C-alpha cells in the first residue's frame, strides 16, 4: 500500500500562507512558509498543530523549500525556523535568498509599527535563520541525504522564482509555486521539461502589449503636455518592470525627462536586480554586453527635494506602504497636469504578475502529469479550472481545503539487473513478439535477473533436465526416422523450424529428441524427447502427435 500523502495547511482554497506538507516515501517535506495577509489574530502564521504539539519539528520534516520571496510564500520563515525551533535544511534560490531578508525585515517594521510584538520575530532571529539556509541554483539536482533529490526550474513570477521537483526513488512531485507563462518585460516564461510526475501542484488565482502601449501613450502625452505622472506600485517585480519599460521607451524616443524612485528600498532592489541578470529575459542577457539596462540614466533621486514642479517630471510611489514620496498630485499639481496610475487623471493599469487559465493548461500539457493538485486561489475559479482539466486533459485532479489530506496511490518500479549477454541475445534473436524467460537471484535487497546458465557459479544452476518418452513400435533407421519425423512436424507445425540437422535428429523450438537404448524387454521400443518449460506446450503436442506412431 504505497502512497504519496499531501496536506495543505494553507492556500488550499485561499490566497495567502502557502504551507503544504508533503510525504512522498517515508520522508516529510514542507513546501512553503508563507503567511496569511489579512487576519492577524494568530492566523497570520501556519498552524503547526498538525505535525507537532510541544516538541521539535526536525524529527519529522526532512526539508523546507521556498518558491520565491513573496510574503504569502515565504513570510513565516523566521517564526517557524527559530521561534518554533526548526534546525534542518532549507532550500531556496539565490535571488530569493538575497531579496527575502530585507523585504521580511520591512514587513517586521510594519508589524512593530502596528505593534504586534506578541507572537512576532525580530531582526536577530532573521539573521540567525538566514545562516541555516542552503541556496539552490537553477536546474540543479540537490541530493540531500541518500535518496531524496530536489530540482528547481524557472517560474517567472519574480526574480528568483522557481518551481520545484521533489524526487525520491522513481516517484516525483512537481510543485509549481507561482508562475506565469505570459512573460514580462524583464523576465522569461516558466519552462519545465516533460518530467511526467506522479503529482503536480499548481496555483490558480485567475493583449498585454496593447495595455503597455496604452500606458506608454498616457505617459508620453502627459509629459508632452506637462502632466506629472505618479505610479503607486507595491510589487518590486512590477516596479522594476515599469522602470525598464519606461527606460526603454525613453531611450527609443530619446527624451530627457527624469524618473524617480524610493531612496531606501528600490535602491537595494535595483542593486540586487543588477547583480542577478542571468535570471532575466534573453533580450536583457543578450543586450548586457553593450551596456547595463539596470544602470539606466533615469536613476534620479526621490525628487528635487519635492520641488521639481508639476511639469513633465516622472516618479514612482506605492499604495497605502513603504514606497517613495508621492509628492506629485497634492503637493504639486492639483489640476489637469497630473496622472496617477493606482491599480488629475485617474487610471488603473493591470499587469499580469500571476498566471491565467491558458498558461496553467499549457503547463499541465507540457509536464504531462499523472495527477494534478490545485492550490492558491479562489475556490470558484479552482472549480472552473478543475472542470476544464477533467474535460479537456482527462486527468484526475484534487481540490483541497486547509487541513485536508489529499492522498494518492503509487506504482513504484523495482530496479533490478540484467546480464548483458542475455539482453543482447534477446534483442538479436527477437528483432528478426516472443517471450523472455529469465531467472532472478533476489539477494538481500540486491536483485539480479539473469539467464539460467549464468547462475552456475553461484552454487546455483544445477540443471533439471526433463525427458518425455514416446512409445513407437518402429525399428527403422535412425536418420530415416528423424527425417520423417522432421518432415511430419514441418507439415503439422506451421513453419517453426525448416532445417536439415547435422546429427540426424529432431528439434523443434528448444526440445531435444533422442533415439535412446530401449528397456530390458526385447519387445519394447521407446523414443525419448527432452525439453524445457519454455517449449513444453509444443512438446506435449509433439508427443501426442507421435503417440499414433510411425507406420509400423
Amino acid at each position: 500500500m504505497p502512497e504519496i500523502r499531501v496536506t495543505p495547511l494553507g492556500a488550499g482554497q485561499d490566497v495567502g500562507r502557502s504551507c503544504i506538507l508533503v510525504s512522498i516515501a517515508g520522508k516529510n517535506v514542507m513546501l512553503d512558509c508563507g503567511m496569511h495577509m489579512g487576519f492577524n489574530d494568530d492566523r497570520r502564521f501556519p498552524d503547526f498543530s498538525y505535525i507537532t504539539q510541544n516538541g521539535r519539528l526536525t524529527d519529522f520534516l526532512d526539508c523546507v523549500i521556498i518558491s520565491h520571496f513573496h510574503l504569502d510564500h515565504c513570510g513565516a520563515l523566521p517564526y517557524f525556523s527559530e521561534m518554533v525551533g526548526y534546525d534542518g535544511p532549507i532550500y531556496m534560490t539565490h535571488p530569493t535568498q538575497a531579496i527575502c531578508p530585507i523585504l521580511l525585515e520591512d514587513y517586521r517594521k510594519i508589524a512593530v509599527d502596528k505593534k504586534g510584538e506578541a507572537n512576532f520575530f525580530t531582526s536577530q532571529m532573521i539573521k540567525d535563520c538566514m545562516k541555516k539556509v542552503v541556496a539552490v541554483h537553477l536546474h540543479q539536482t540537490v541530493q540531500v541525504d541518500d535518496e531524496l533529490e530536489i530540482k528547481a526550474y524557472y517560474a517567472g513570477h519574480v526574480l528568483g522564482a522557481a518551481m520545484f521537483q521533489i524526487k525520491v526513488g522513481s516517484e516525483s512531485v512537481v510543485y509549481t509555486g507561482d508562475y506565469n507563462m505570459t512573460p514580462d518585460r524583464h523576465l522569461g516564461a516558466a519552462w519545465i521539461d516533460k518530467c511526467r510526475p506522479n503529482l503536480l501542484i499548481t496555483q490558480s488565482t485567475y493583449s498585454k502589449r496593447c495595455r503597455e502601449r496604452d500606458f506608454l501613450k498616457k505617459v508620453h502625452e502627459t509629459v508632452e503636455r506637462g502632466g506629472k505622472v505618479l505610479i503607486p506600485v507595491f510589487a518590486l517585480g512590477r516596479a522594476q518592470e515599469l522602470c525598464i519599460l519606461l527606460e526603454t521607451f525613453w531611450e527609443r524616443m530619446n527624451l530627457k525627462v527624469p524618473i524617480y524612485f524610493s531612496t531606501g528600498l528600490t535602491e537595494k532592489a535595483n542593486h540586487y536586480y543588477k547583480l542577478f541578470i542571468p535570471w532575466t529575459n534573453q533580450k536583457i542577457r543578450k543586450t548586457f554586453v553593450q551596456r547595463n539596462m539596470f544602470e539606466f540614466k533615469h536613476i534620479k533621486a526621490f525628487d528635487r527635494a519635492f520641488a521639481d514642479n508639476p511639469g513633465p517630471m516622472v516618479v514612482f510611489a506605492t499604495p497605502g506602504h513603504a514606497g517613495q514620496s508621492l509628492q506629485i498630485f497634492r503637493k504639486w499639481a492639483g489640476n489637469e497636469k497630473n496622472m496617477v496610475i493606482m491599480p488629475m487623471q485617474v487610471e488603473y493599469m493591470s499587469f499580469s504578475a500571476h498566471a491565467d487559465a491558458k498558461g496553467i493548461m499549457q503547463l499541465v500539457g507540457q509536464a504531462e502529469p499523472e495527477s494534478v493538485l490545485l492550490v492558491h486561489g479562489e475556490a470558484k475559479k479552482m472549480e472552473f479550472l478543475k472542470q476544464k482539466i477533467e474535460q479537456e486533459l482527462r486527468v484526475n485532479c484534487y481540490m483541497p481545503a486547509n487541513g485536508e489530506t489529499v492522498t494518492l496511490p503509487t506504482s513504484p518500479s523495482i530496479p533490478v539487473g540484467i546480464s548483458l549477454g542475455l539482453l543482447k541475445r534477446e534483442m538479436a534473436q527477437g528483432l528478426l513478439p516472443r517471450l523472455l524467460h529469465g531467472t532472478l537471484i533476489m539477494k538481500d535487497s540486491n536483485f539480479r535477473l539473469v539467464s539460467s546458465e549464468q547462475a552456475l557459479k553461484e552454487l546455483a544452476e544445477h540443471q533439471l533436465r526433463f525427458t518425455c518418452r514416446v512409445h513407437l513400435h518402429d525399428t527403422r533407421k535412425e536418420q530415416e526416422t528423424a527425417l520423417r519425423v522432421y518432415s511430419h512436424l514441418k507439415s503439422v507445425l506451421k513453419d517453426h523450424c525448416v532445417q536439415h540437422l547435422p546429427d540426424g535428429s529432431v528439434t523443434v523450438e528448444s526440445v531435444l529428441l533422442q533415439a535412446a537404448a530401449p528397456s530390458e524387454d526385447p519387445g519394447t521400443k521407446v523414443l525419448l524427447v527432452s525439453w524445457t518449460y519454455q517449449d513444453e506446450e509444443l512438446g506435449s503436442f509433439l508427443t501426442s502427435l507421435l503417440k499414433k506412431g510411425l507406420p509400423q
Binding site: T182, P183, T248, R252, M427
Partner: protein, 386 residues
Amino acid sequence: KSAALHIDLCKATSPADALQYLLQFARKPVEAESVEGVVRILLEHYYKENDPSVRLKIASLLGLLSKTAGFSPDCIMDDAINILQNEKSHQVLAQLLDTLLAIGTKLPENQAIQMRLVDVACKHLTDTSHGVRNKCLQLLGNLGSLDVQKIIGDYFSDQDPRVRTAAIKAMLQLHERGLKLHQTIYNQACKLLSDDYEQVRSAAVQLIWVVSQLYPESIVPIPSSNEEIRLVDDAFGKICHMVSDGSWVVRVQAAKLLGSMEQVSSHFLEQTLDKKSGACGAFVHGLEDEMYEVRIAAVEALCMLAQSSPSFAEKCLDFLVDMFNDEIEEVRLQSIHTMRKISNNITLREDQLDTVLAVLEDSSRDIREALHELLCCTNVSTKEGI
C-alpha cells in the same frame, strides 16, 4: 608511390604505429591508378588485421579515397561489399556503410550498384548498434526510388530516437530526390509528433509538412468524432499545436512550415489568429514568445500567409501594429516590412493609422525609413487621416 606502403605497412607494428602512419597518408591526394593500387593493398591489410580501431581507420580513408574525382569505383565496390558481409565489429560496419554511401553519392547513374547497395543495407538493417542502422537508413534515403518507403516507415517506431530521426530524414531525402510519397506515413508522423526527443519532433514536423504539401486535398477523419476534413487543415492544426512546444528550435521550424502552407481554409486561420481544436491562438503565442527568432519567424509566416490569402490580412493588421513597439529592432523592422507587403490592398482605420504614425519619433533612422516605405504603400480612410 604505393610499393613504399607495400613494404612499410606489413613491416610495421600493429597497435599505433600503423594507425599513425595511416593517419599520415590521409593528408595527401592520390591519382586514380594509384587509387586502385591503394584500395587493393588496404583491402589486403583489412583481411589480415584483427584490431577494430585500425580497421575503422582503414575503412574511413577507403571512403576518403573513393571521394577522389575521376575513377570508376564499382569494381572495387564489389569486393568491398563482399568483405562487408562477414564483418562483425559494429563501429567498423558503420564506417563501411559510410564509405558505400560515399560511392552511392559518387556514382548515382548505374542502377546495378543501386539495387546491390539497397539489398546490403536491408540485410544489415536488423543490427543492434544504432549507428549501423543510422547509416543503413541514410543509405536507403540517398539511394532507392521506384519498396523503400514501407521499409523506412517500419523503423519509425525504433526505440533509439537517433534511428527515428535518421528514418524521418531519409524519407525527407527521398522526397527531395523526387519521389511521390504516401498518405499512410501521415499517421506515423502524427504519432512521432506526440512526445519525442526534440530532434525527432523537428524532423517529424518537417515530414508532416511535406506530406501535407503532397496530398493537400485528401480527406482524413477526426480520430474521436466522425466529421470529415481536408488533410492539409488538420496538418495545419497539428503544426499549430507545436508552436507551444518547449523547444524553441522546433517552434522556429513549425513557424516556417506554417508560413509555407497556403491552402488552409480561412476558418482555421481566423481560429488560430483569434485570442478572445488545438489550433486556436497559435500565432498570438508565437508573437508573445521570448525568443526574438521565434517572433521574427512567426511574423514572416504572417507575411506569407496574408500574401497568399488576401481576406486573412484584415485580422492581423492590429497585431502587426503592436509589433512596432517590440523590444528587438529587427523584429520591429520585420513587422514594418510585413505591413508594407500586406497593407497594399487593404485600408487602415484612424486609430491604427495614428499608432502607426506615432512611432515615427523613434531614433532608429532605419526603422524610420522603413516606416516611410510602409507609408508609401498604406491606404487612408479619411482626409483627417492624411
